[PDB]
């Protein structure tokens, strides 16, 4: 987790933190979408045009 | 003129020295790096 992230107590000088903000360690101890919905306005028994694959220009009822 | 050359270490290898409990008691714990998420953080935005 992003817990165990802690600020370093060093003040080394190689790296300097300008404001109150201090350098962050970002370390942990060593031990260790989408709905794809049915489309509205297609009810039980709507008349429909088929435009793909095997049937083209052929109407069908759901 | 010659006299017989000394070594810098007393031992052959290091690994006996580090693994001893004289050293190990003083050490801090072994850290390891977290990988960071890529993503709603805040608990209630819908008050706004």
Listed residue (B28, B38, B29, B33) closest to A25, CA to CA = B33
Give the resolution value in Å. 3.2
- CA dist A9 and B38 (Å) reads 28
Chain centroid to Cα B20, Å, comes to: 15
Interface contact A28-B36, CB threshold 8 A:
no
List CB contacts (< 8 A) between B36 and chain A: 2, 26
A8: Cβ–Cβ under 8 A, 6 or more apart, which residues?
A22, A23, A24, A25
Method: cryo-EM
Pairing mode, if any, of strands A27-29 and B31-33?
antiparallel
Nearest to B33 among A1, A2, A27 (CB): A27
Scanning every residue of chain A, which has its alpha carbon at the shortest distance from the alpha carbon of B37? Answer: A2
């Amino acid at each position: 987790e992003l817990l165990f992230i802690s600020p370093i107590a060093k003040k080394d000088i190689k790296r300097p933190s300008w404001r109150g903000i201090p350098r962050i360690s970002f370390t942990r101890p060593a031990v260790a979408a989408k709905a794809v919905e049915t489309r509205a306005n297609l009810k039980v028994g709507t008349v429909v045009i088929i435009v793909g694959g095997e049937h083209q220009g052929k109407r069908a009822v759901v | 003129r010659f006299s017989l050359p000394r070594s810098i270490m007393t031992n052959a290898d290091i690994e006996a020295v580090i693994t001893s409990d004289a050293v190990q008691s003083v050490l801090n714990e072994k850290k390891e790096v977290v990988p960071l998420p890529k993503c709603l953080s805040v608990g209630a935005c819908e008050d706004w």
